[PDB]
Amino acid sequence: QPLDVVVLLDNSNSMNNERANNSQRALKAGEAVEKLIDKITSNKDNRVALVTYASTIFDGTEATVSKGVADQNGKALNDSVSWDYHKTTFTATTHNYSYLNLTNDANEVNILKSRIPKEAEHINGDRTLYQFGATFTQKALMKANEILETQSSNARKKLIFHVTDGVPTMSYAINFNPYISTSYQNQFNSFLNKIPDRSGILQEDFIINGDDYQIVKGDGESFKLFSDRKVPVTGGTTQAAYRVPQNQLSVMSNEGYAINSGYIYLYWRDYNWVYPFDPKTKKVSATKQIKTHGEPTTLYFNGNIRPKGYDIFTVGIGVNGDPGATPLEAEKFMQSISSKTENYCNVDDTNCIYDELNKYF
């Protein structure tokens, strides 16, 4: 049977070529993709598609994300020196780095390959698109799956080939119910009960029905969700604050910020917090706690992708855990969202990559 392949390409900010002491993540990821496309399409029956992602799918559409910190009541502000404090969402047109239709047309293949980026955003380049540079792996997996389920069939061979540094920093929320007495652990367990092997959670028990910027967890800050909700002063122990200027003082009060003579003490916005937590009292869960983006992503993978019975190969590029994970956490995560242990390969591990692909070619 012919092979339909979706390439998943991580174009998050962590992939910028300067990162990890010039590890050239994006350049190397783009080259690996070029090589995979050429290899797959050598057989004229096979189809390819490309899903490049970061905070969202980079397909040339407009997207919105939330940014900033918040006061003690969850009221949002941006404390950056380069943005107005009201700038707590950003809206922009993404690069079209995707080819979203499986194809074996040679001219279409050429379009796909022309759309392969070799660089990611820089904090000093496009500062607007830099805001769309989180690692929302879950969303990209959902798009790759949607493509295969929509456009392939049970009789064709299907592959997801995912190239990334392995550190997701955004995820969809697990739909815990704060209003029943069932403990969060028992709620989580009931979600697991729905998958034959209990290793995942179905899409229906994620919060998906809303625009991303209002429902998603994480903003690219970290692999981790934060147990301490207070923003600390850099390198320190003490909570940071936003001094409100004289000229600015009355407008901020009017707006409703918590100002204590005359400082707004800063908290991570609540989509960065360990959850679930009671939405009224803010009491964190005393049982099950989600503490990374890796876990909800793996659960989604295992609930909704792995059962489809096709192959998922993950290729690690310059792997160190940036931001907020260790190198091992990143590997384990990548292995967690591959068909099996040996379908995670470092890009440097050419033997691993040759061996897995050999079956098809």
**Stretch of 12-20, 261-269, 279-287, 342-350 lying at the interface with Mg ion (CB under 5 A):** 12-20
Shortest approach of Mg ion to residue 297 CB, angstroms? 13
DSSP-assigned letters across all residues of 35-58: HHHHHHTTSTT-EEEEEEESSSB-
**Stretch of 8-16, 36-44, 205-213, 352-360 lying at the interface with Mg ion (CB under 5 A):** 8-16
Q: Is residue 88 at the binding interface for Mg ion, with CB under 5 A as the rule?
A: no
Residues 131-150 that bind Mg ion (CB under 5 A): 135
Instruction: Give whichever of 103 and 320 is closer to Mg ion, judged by the CB atom.
Output: 320
Give the count of residues interacting with Mg ion (CB under 5 A): 3
Q: Which of 11, 12, 55, 66 binds Mg ion (CB under 5 A)?
A: 12
Q: Is residue 55 at the binding interface for Mg ion, with CB under 5 A as the rule?
A: no
> DSSP letter at 195?
S
Q: Is residue 171 at the binding interface for Mg ion, with CB under 5 A as the rule?
A: no
Shortest approach of Mg ion to residue 337 CB, angstroms? 14
On whether 135 is known to bind a ligand per the annotation, the reply is yes
DSSP-assigned letters across all residues of 107-157: HHHHHHHHT--S----TTS-TTGGGG-S--HHHHHHHHHHHHHHH--TTSE
Q: Is residue 23 at the binding interface for Mg ion, with CB under 5 A as the rule?
A: no
On whether 270 is known to bind a ligand per the annotation, the reply is no
Instruction: Give whichever of 24 and 135 is closer to Mg ion, judged by the CB atom.
Output: 135
On whether 212 is known to bind a ligand per the annotation, the reply is no
Shortest approach of Mg ion to residue 226 CB, angstroms? 18
DSSP-assigned letters across all residues of 243-302: EPPTTTHHHHHHHT---BTTEEE-EE-GGGB-B-B-TTT-PBPSS--B-BSHHHHHHHHH
Query: β-strands 69-70, 76-77: how paired?
Result: antiparallel
Residue among 193, 203, 166, 164 nearest 308 (CA): 203
Q: Is residue 14 at the binding interface for Mg ion, with CB under 5 A as the rule?
A: yes
**Stretch of 78-86, 130-138, 309-317, 325-333 lying at the interface with Mg ion (CB under 5 A):** 130-138
**Stretch of 7-15, 91-99, 201-209, 332-340 lying at the interface with Mg ion (CB under 5 A):** 7-15
**Stretch of 55-63, 128-136, 170-178, 326-334 lying at the interface with Mg ion (CB under 5 A):** 128-136
Q: Report the chain's C-alpha Rg in angstroms.
A: 21
Instruction: Collapse the DSSP code of 238 into the 3-class scheme (helix H, G, I; strand E, B; otherwise coil) and give the result.
Output: coil
Instruction: Give whichever of 14 and 41 is closer to Mg ion, judged by the CB atom.
Output: 14
Please count the other Cβ atoms lying within 10 Å of the Cβ belonging to residue 250. 10
Please count the other Cβ atoms lying within 10 Å of the Cβ belonging to residue 200. 22
Q: Is residue 56 at the binding interface for Mg ion, with CB under 5 A as the rule?
A: no
Residue 226 half-sphere exposure, CB side, CA atoms within 13 Å? 18
Residue among 189, 191, 137, 183 nearest 163 (CA): 137
Shortest approach of Mg ion to residue 260 CB, angstroms? 36
Instruction: Give whichever of 7 and 77 is closer to Mg ion, judged by the CB atom.
Output: 7
Q: Is residue 343 at the binding interface for Mg ion, with CB under 5 A as the rule?
A: no
Please count the other Cβ atoms lying within 10 Å of the Cβ belonging to residue 165. 26
Specify binding-site residues for Mg(2+): 10, 12, 14, 135, 165
Specify binding-site residues: 10, 12, 14, 135, 165
Which residues form the interface with Mg ion (CB under 5 A)?
12, 14, 135
